[PDB]
Amino acid sequence: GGVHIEPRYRQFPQLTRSQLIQAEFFSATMWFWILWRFWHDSDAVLGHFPYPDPSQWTDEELGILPDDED
Amino acid sequence: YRHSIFAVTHVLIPVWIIHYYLKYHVTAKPYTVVERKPRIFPGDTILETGEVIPLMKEFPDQH
Amino acid sequence: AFSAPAAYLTHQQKVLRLYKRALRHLESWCVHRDKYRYFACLMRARFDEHKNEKDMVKATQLLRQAEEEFWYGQHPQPYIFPESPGGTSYERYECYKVPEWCLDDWHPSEKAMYPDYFAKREQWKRLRRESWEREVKQLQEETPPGGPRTEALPPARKEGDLPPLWWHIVTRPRERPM
Amino acid sequence: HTGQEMIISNWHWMTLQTVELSLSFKMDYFSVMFIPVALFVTWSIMEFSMWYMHS
Amino acid sequence: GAHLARRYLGDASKEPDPLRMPTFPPDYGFPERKEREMVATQQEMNDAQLMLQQRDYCAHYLIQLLKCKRDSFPNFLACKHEQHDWDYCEHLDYVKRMKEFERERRLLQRKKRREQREAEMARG
Amino acid sequence: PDSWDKDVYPEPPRRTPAPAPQTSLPNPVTYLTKIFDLLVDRPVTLAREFIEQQHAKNRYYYYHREFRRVPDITECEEKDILCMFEAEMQWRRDYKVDQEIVNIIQERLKACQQREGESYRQNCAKELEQFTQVSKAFQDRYSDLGAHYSARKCLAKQKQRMLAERKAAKEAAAA
Amino acid sequence: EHGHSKMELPDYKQWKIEGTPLETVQEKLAARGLRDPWGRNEAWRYSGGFANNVSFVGALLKGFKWGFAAFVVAVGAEYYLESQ
Amino acid sequence: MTLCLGAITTLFTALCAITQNDIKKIVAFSTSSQLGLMMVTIGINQPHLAFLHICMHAFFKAMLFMCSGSIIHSLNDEQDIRKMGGLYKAMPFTTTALIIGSLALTGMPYLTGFYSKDLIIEAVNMSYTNAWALLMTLIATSLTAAYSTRIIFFAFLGKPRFPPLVLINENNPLLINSIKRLLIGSIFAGFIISNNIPPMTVPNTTMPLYMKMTALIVT
Amino acid sequence: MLKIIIPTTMLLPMTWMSKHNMIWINATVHSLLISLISLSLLNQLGENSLNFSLTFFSDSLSAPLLVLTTWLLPLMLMASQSHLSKETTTRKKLYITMLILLQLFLIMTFTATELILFYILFEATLVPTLIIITRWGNQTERLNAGLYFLFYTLAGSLPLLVALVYIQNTTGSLNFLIIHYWSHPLSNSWSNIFMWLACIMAFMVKMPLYGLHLWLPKAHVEAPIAGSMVLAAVLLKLGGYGMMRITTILNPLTNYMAYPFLMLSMWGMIMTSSICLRQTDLKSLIAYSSVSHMALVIVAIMIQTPWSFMGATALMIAHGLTSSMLFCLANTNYERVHSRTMILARGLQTLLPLMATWWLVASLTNLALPPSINLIGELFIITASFSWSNITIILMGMNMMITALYSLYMLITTQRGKYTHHINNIKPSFTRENALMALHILPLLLLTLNPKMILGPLY
Amino acid sequence: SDAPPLTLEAIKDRVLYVLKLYDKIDPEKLSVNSHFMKDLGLDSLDQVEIIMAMEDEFGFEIPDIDAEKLMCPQEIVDYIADKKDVYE
Amino acid sequence: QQERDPWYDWDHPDLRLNWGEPIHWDLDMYIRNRVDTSPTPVSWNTMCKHLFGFVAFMLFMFWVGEIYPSYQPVGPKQYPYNDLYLERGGDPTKEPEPVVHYEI
Amino acid sequence: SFPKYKPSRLATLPATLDPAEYDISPETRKAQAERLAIRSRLKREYLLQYNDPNRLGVIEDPALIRWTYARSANIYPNFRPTPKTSLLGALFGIGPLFFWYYVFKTDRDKKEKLIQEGKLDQTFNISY
């Protein structure tokens, strides 16, 4: 199916530029996809809706009377 | 040419047989093929009757 | 495998075997080559400190202490070569090894294929048939009375002789028959 | 597109008093989603095995 | 979380029990007590047959989202406004639940301070 | 299709939505359905027409068998074996028919559960009630008879149930 | 058709301990008075294309440069097309 | 019971995986831990999310095994990671594919494993569950990251350790095509399936800042 | 029914007036034709029965057993062809005569409108089997085995006869139809308890019940291949058929008396299955597997529910076919090795691949792989037992597990591994053995298409 | 697999290549028939290290009972050829 | 039989037995496909203690987690139509006791 | 000094850790010599009968026959009724039966009492 590549016996194996450009292209498209999604949809990681502070609410809205009425 | 004959016998012949079996024999008997009823949303129109499902209660739109 | 075992292991054999086992398990512990070389040289140095030692009792006190240390630090998951008795491919091809006598059961239509092979096979069968009659008497005469003392076999000593009991060693199926 | 769901009880095997056993297939969301994924993975692994098991 | 650390290490009765909410009358806070309003009626919210746990007060936005997802099918990125609105409604529901939690918490605080104050006055 | 009775197997009117394309992007589903029809349904339909005309060329009938009523086990003498045989056969046929009635109700229940989608717990309450009633009746009639069941054992079970009912009703009336 | 063309071995004078961690091993041994008789055998593991190593973060960041370039080009195109 | 069983399973199998030397054993303990995570998802009453995780795990775990097998065939039936050395440059396509697979397995954002595992963690944080089960789920996430690191480091970064006769070869169209199809899958299928299926559970719209990101910190 | 009885009788003069070299062909062909004719009996009614006459009647419990009985003879002839080659023509004709007599007795037994005629033929089947075991048996223990197979059986069945005649003195008839229609409850009494025991233990000994099973490994190991096939396939099912027939009169006493035997079966199916794990002989392993399956059948019969009876019928038919095929495979190995030891000849898959496939299918059916009829019977019995009591499942579950183990053990010890080196006389499998395995296995996978034909009268 | 069919020339060359990388043995004095203990003056531990180097270079490990009686490079080559079934 | 010599030239290499040698009574039990008695890197008692301890600790801590669950500072979820009465169970002819949800 | 390894039944003592092999004595060496002598005699006989071109069957092994005979047919003539055998037989052959009898009888009595009281909810339980 492929081309003839010979053994080497203690030196680096023969590499085709095809597999090199293919691996680089797929790694590059992985990183491009990650960056593109982070730019276009960043709310999936950092969140979009703020978390309220429970102590910052006032007793007016929480149904609290000054400890004397009821 | 190989993939043309493949799809003709491998894919096409079985589908004709399966379709023939389902639409004339399996569906001859009641309750053999039961489909989940399609979803109905406000504003949809039904082919059989023609009537229009009313819209909602105009909720207050904000943000 | 090939060599018949002796009655026992001398102190030399035990020490050499322990040295090889310790080197192998140290290699397992030290993955990298430079670290393994450093610690292997250090192990060799610790190993020959008592090389020139003389009396047997204290030397046997050693190698005994060493055995305990090795069993304490033996790397419960050592490296094993793939074809070794613990390897991941130890007996992978044992299902592809077919005995030669199976060929005698082939149909004549099957033997019509591959005819030169079967001519050579007939030559081999004839050679075995004669050599066996020679080998049986050679073993009868060469064997000490009262039975063999070891499972080591003598070679062939004449011109036309073949080694006694040779058929099932030379006709091993193969290492990777398929 | 729509959310098509379906049950196909095509072949009736046998009936034991009031219990009916038939050849019935469920083609809900889970089935129609897991069939293509398994078929894709199996296709790729078979292609890989064409090379891995050549000997 | 901190409420776990407080409840499991401090006074158990000091902090509310999620299994038994609420432990106080709804009118105990203030007498107005405006009610929640549910937008989608039973018939349409059944015809869309969402799910039994998706059948909350945010259901109308989910209906709109499903309407678009069926309508603009091939372009599965057409509608984000409805998804955003449904997420906002769910966020509002969650903050109302958080408000209820903190309301019962501080109501129990005030109640406890009460009966201890009357205990002090009785002992005096 | 007239192949089965619509009253025995009820089905709702099957209201379906109409397509409301909100985008100009052509979908693949409609084109796939069109090519599926043209490539599959037409040849199947023509083959069916050929087979149907061949069948219409040779038309012949078959009939359903009717069974007269016979005295049941309650009106059979103690040792009269002929009437016992007839009553036993009648009871066995009635048992088979009851089994098929329960089968029909169960099929209704299953079809309702599949059809209703996610609102089955509400929209199949009538079918659930009807199955509960049929199951109660069948269980009272035939359960616990054993492997060697017969009309006499069913009659004895019914008689014991009726004695229990009469005793309980009499006790409640005079309390 | 298999790999039959009579491959040759390299010359054994090519393997020099020079330029490896095996200097460190030999020096740390000689500080105690020892030598590695097989140090030269393994030099091929550090000699040729194996002379350069890549860090874990570098391995993870295999195609970050081309991906980042394509990403910024796409963002520039999108900005210039939306603001029209 | 389902939650407890899933939690103990994922923890124990990840802890066993953390120190294995056979590559196939490492990946097998990885898939056992992922199955335990699926069972945990079931235990917190989130079935469709568990199905989605099944679908993503299919892609990236199948590709991980195929890369492992490619290396095993390349180095003459060898599996022990003590004898794989520098393969980052020796075989680049297997390296990049297995890197992408290990990133997806650990839930690197905007990959196939993100859209399932991130939601798993968010759902398990804010549910009325055992404290212990949540703790062991977090530790299982950390150990998943750690054994992915172990595979990468011990098989691709150092100096070579295989026998001298180099027989490394990748140029077969069958292997390349089979790997690349699941590469494209494990990159884009997560997004595609997540955005095509109808919503089947209430979202976790609001989260504490530390609780929303906890999976990333653990990994 | 005489259309099946008369040709089987005519098989005798046809055999005795055949050529010295044409007895096997003639016997096989006409036995297959008789099986094809008996195929007619399968059609049944949802009502009572197919009452042919005052003497013979057929039911959907009798029909599958009759069909299997008729089908088993040609296979027995094919397997007996090989090891009787050096036998004189008279003795081969005598062997065929014994097989024909046994088939005739079984055919008349399964119809048997009356209980005394059923008893007479039920015990008549004892003589040809005894002669087959003790005459054409290889080992020296065959004689001893024969004695066991005799006396156990008679020890169980001599009280039964007494009980039977006693019943006719009280009810006036032993005809099955009148016994069904005129049934009355049995009061709890010492006399009724003993009449129950006398009616039951006769069929309990032949299943066999655990603790009364000792004759079975002996009789199966020391018998020739045809003897083993007929013993495991049909002669074990006589007890189950008799229990299904006779329990219609033992109620309501059966519920009270069920416990002593149910335990002996429910625990027994464990013990015997465990015995299969440590067995150095193939034939003994297959015999003990038969004991376990028939123990489950005993449980099903004692529970006495419609699902119990359907499962018991299906399991009886499936077990007959499976055990016969397993015995045939073991015999094909034995005819080559002459040893009858599991561990001796190994690695036979590499030498005889198609026979290894046959072994795999036979073990898979024995393992109760769905949707085979073996699992249909097992599942029906398990559901019925669960309805009887929710704890039985534990025992049942364990048995299932254990079964799988030894089944695959039997497959792995003999077929997988490395071949024994010093065995060089393993010739390729003949067309005869392959056809024998095919004719065993194909009816099973065909019957899994139409289960109602083997599920009995309560379907 | 796709592994080349190694020959006796390859085995001999590889064995001598590994032995030459052993600095304890000078390369000009060793031959295929050169004994280890007497002609090369090596201790038994050096022999077991040579056997281990052979194992690591060829990928299979020799049983110790066979390893301890390998004393010439020609004998090692012959043993490996016999194990791997090499024709020429 | 797993701990027999794997490099010896046995007559039955897979069984690791020699022709004519006495055979262990429990030979079927130890056939390399079943229980093996090979020595282990760790003592048997130590493994038993560690494994038992690991399981007991996990069960105890799971019980503790059941005693002390984890949750978020929220109240119970609210459902519109009387806690969704009609479509959870049904029974429309009872007019159940109404509950109304508090808007806060 | 190191922690010691403790042998058990299912984890036996390694050969290298056996102090017996270090107590080397002349009779020990002679015993090993005669052991390997009988092993070699048996191996010689087996190889003589195995390599024979005329033998075209199986090599009958007395050891395997002895093993099978002792496992199967030599049990009963050597059986002697002893308190050990009697108690073990009674326990392992009666105790499980009565235990399961008690369990099942208790379960079915509870179920029947619940049925008679009528509080069991056997609804939909049609098939039995």
Ligand SMILES: CCCCCCCCCCCCCCCCC[C@@H](O)O[C@H](CO[C@H](O)CCCCCCCCCCCCCCC)COP(=O)(O)OCC[N+](C)(C)C
């Ligand atoms: C390896 C290469 C293979 C190549 C061939 C491939 C072809 C694919 C087909 C393979 C199996 C697929 C099964 C598909 C089903 C087709 C057959 C089926 O439909 O027929 C069954 C029918 O088959 C029979 O029921 C089963 C055969 C019975 C076997 C009896 C054996 C007879 C002699 C054996 C001796 C007896 C020994 C055992 C004693 C009991 C069920 O039919 P059913 O829907 O229900 O109604 C029949 C028609 N009606 C509607 C008119 C009533």
Ligand SMILES: CCCCCCCC/C=C\CCCCCCCC(=O)O[C@H](COC(=O)CCCCCCC/C=C/CCCCCCCC)COP(=O)(O)OCCN
């Ligand atoms: C391989 C071993 C199997 C051996 C099995 C044998 C045991 C069978 C059970 C007992 C056999 C005889 C039972 C009687 C035969 C039926 C007769 C009958 O039903 O009538 C009874 C007959 O009752 C008897 O005769 C009982 C006497 C029993 C004497 C022999 C006892 C043998 C030992 C029995 C105990 C063992 C029980 C379990 C044995 C299991 C098998 C090992 C009532 O008496 P009537 O005269 O009619 O009274 C009417 C007016 N009131």
Ligand SMILES: CCCCCCCCCCCC(=O)SCCNC(=O)CCNC(=O)[C@H](O)C(C)(C)COP(=O)(O)O
């Ligand atoms: C990683 C796991 C832990 C490993 C722990 C290993 C423990 C190592 C420490 C062992 C301590 C010892 O050396 S124990 C030392 C035992 N006693 C002796 O060594 C004295 C006499 N030995 C000989 O003469 C030999 O033959 C010899 C000369 C060596 C070579 O022989 P050759 O000339 O024929 O090659």
